[PDB]
Amino acid sequence: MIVIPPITDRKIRFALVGCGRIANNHFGALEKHADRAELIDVCDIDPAALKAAVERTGARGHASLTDMLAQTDADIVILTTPSGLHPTQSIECSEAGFHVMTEKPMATRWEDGLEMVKAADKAKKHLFVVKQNRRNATLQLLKRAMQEKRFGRIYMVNVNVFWTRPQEYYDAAGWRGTWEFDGGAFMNQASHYVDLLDWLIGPVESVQAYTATLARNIEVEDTGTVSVKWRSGALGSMNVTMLTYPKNLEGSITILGEKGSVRVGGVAVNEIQHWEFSEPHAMDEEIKDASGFGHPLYYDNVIKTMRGEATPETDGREGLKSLELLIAMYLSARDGRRVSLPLDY
């Protein structure tokens, strides 16, 4: 990271590639931030999807990324393509001189994640990874409790993601449900919960995982469980399935330590259900209210970074922390063995 000069007297310019489902949320976010930011170029290999985006946003349209990169003077290129394409696209963006914002997960394979970080490092350009859930109110209070050491020593952690994805979800596009482009219940659907393991609880020492495809016609897991050991000695598990009858049931985390016990549950870690500490704290009166956000807030940090006003909340190197866990869980489930971190020396 060299010092990069702030961008001062114009809006920040965005280009976007992959005009599908979540691109809608990025369009909305950018619309909100229209005084500080504009979307000037969009790219999709499917003419209709590209048509809809160009008509909605007013941006110029392009049929390939390589062409858009030859033309755009965007500051940042946003990757909202299938997950397994993020690495090659990010590296091409970096090598052409652009900051990159990649949707999660940043890669589907470990060396691809590493290579996208190395390319951004060498270009002296930012790589932002979208982890928009971290700023949720419940997850912020948890993070604050952790930063203050309210739990003392952590002993036990349980994360559950009991959700529902029918066959028609995976059949919506060829990329979905594939190792190369998607990953399964852990790498795609529950990835914002995998993220909590290192971000809230701290460095992981090792994992032991089982995964399976118990019902869907896909090659990735629809169901999995992982035993986790933290370098602090804390132990825990994360359990996920997309096969829950008959709709989404639970997105929860329970954290138990020496001097505190918390559970945040609901369908999406959205309800503080248990909140008990050995000593009270100012933050405790926000607890009913804790129970925009998402992409719009994420974009405020990216904009501030470009203006010299802040630093990335989640850069490529931060993204590697949860990717390395996902890849250790996948190796452990594949080979039936404990896999320890870090993956590389």
Ligand X SMILES: NC(=O)C1=CN([C@@H]2O[C@H](COP(=O)(O)OP(=O)(O)OC[C@H]3O[C@@H](n4cnc5c(N)ncnc54)[C@H](O)[C@@H]3O)[C@@H](O)[C@H]2O)C=CC1
Ligand Y SMILES: CC(=O)N[C@H]1[C@@H](OP(=O)(O)OP(=O)(O)OC[C@H]2O[C@@H](n3ccc(=O)[nH]c3=O)[C@H](O)[C@@H]2O)O[C@H](C(=O)O)[C@@H](O)[C@@H]1O
User: Structure tokens of 205?
Assistant: 């020492």
Specify whether the CB–CB gap between 151 and 257 falls below 8 A.
Answer: yes
Residues 222-281 that bind Na ion (CB under 5 A): none
CA–CA gap between residue 116 and residue 29 (Å, rounded) = 25
Angle, to 10 degrees, between the axis of helix 23-32 and the axis of helix 47-57? 10
57 assigned to a ligand binding site: no
Residue for token pair 């390589």:
66
Check binding of 52 to its own copies (CB under 8 A): no
Kindly give, in sequence order, each residue whose CB lies less than 8 Å from that of residue 167, ignoring residues fewer than 6 positions away. 216, 217
Give the one residue of 133, 160, 241, 322 binding ligand Y; rule: CB under 6 A: 133
Count of residues that bind ligand Y according to CB under 6 A: 11
* Alpha-carbon gap, residue 85 to 278, rounded angstroms: 48
Q: Which does 94 bind (CB under 5 to 8 A by kind): its own copies, ligand X, Na ion, none?
A: none
**Which residue's CB atom is positioned nearest to Cl ion?**
265
Kindly state whether residue 189 participates in binding ligand Y, applying the rule CB under 6 A: yes
Q: Has 46 been labeled as part of a binding site?
A: no
**Does 341 participate in binding its own copies (rule CB under 8 A)?**
yes
Query: Which residue in 86, 135, 150, 192 binds ligand Y (CB under 6 A)?
Result: 192
* Structure-token pair, residue 209: 């995982």
**Per rule CB under 6 A, is residue 26 in the interface with ligand Y?**
no
Query: Does position 332 bind Na ion by CB under 5 A?
Result: no
Q: How far is it, in rounded angstroms, from Cα 179 to Cα 14?
A: 29
Q: Is 301 in the site for ligand Y (CB under 6 A)?
A: no
The angle formed by the CA atoms of residues 190, 76 and 122, to the nearest 5 degrees, is: 90
Using rule CB under 8 A, residue 56 touches its own copies: no
Which partner, ligand X, Na ion, Cl ion, none, binds residue 250 by CB below 5 to 8 Å per kind? Cl ion
For 28, the token pair is 């909305």
Binding mask 246-285 for ligand Y (x = CB under 6 A): -xx-------------------------------------
- Does 310 sit near its own copies (CB under 8 A)? no
Is 130 near ligand X (CB under 6 A)? yes
Smallest gap from residue 137 Cβ to Na ion (A): 35
**Shortest separation between residue 31's beta carbon and its own copies, angstroms:** 29
Site string for its own copies, 101-140 (x = CB under 8 A): --------xx----------xx-x----------------
Residue 224: closest CA among 159, 134, 319, 172: 159
Can you say whether the dihedral through the CA atoms of 127, 133, 138, 139 is positive or negative?
negative
Do 186 and 221 contact (CB within 8 A), yes or no? yes
Burial per residue of 290-324, b for 16 or more beta-carbon CB atoms within 10 angstroms, e otherwise: beeeebbbbbbbbbbbbeeeeebbbbbebbbbbbb
Residue 211 is a binding residue for Na ion (CB under 5 A): yes
Q: How many residues bind ligand X (CB under 6 A)?
A: 24
Annotated binding-site residues for NADH read 21-22, 44, 81, 83, 86, 103-104, 132, 175-176, 192
Q: Which residues bind ligand X (CB under 6 A)?
A: 17-23, 43-46, 49, 65, 80-83, 85, 103-104, 130, 132, 173, 188
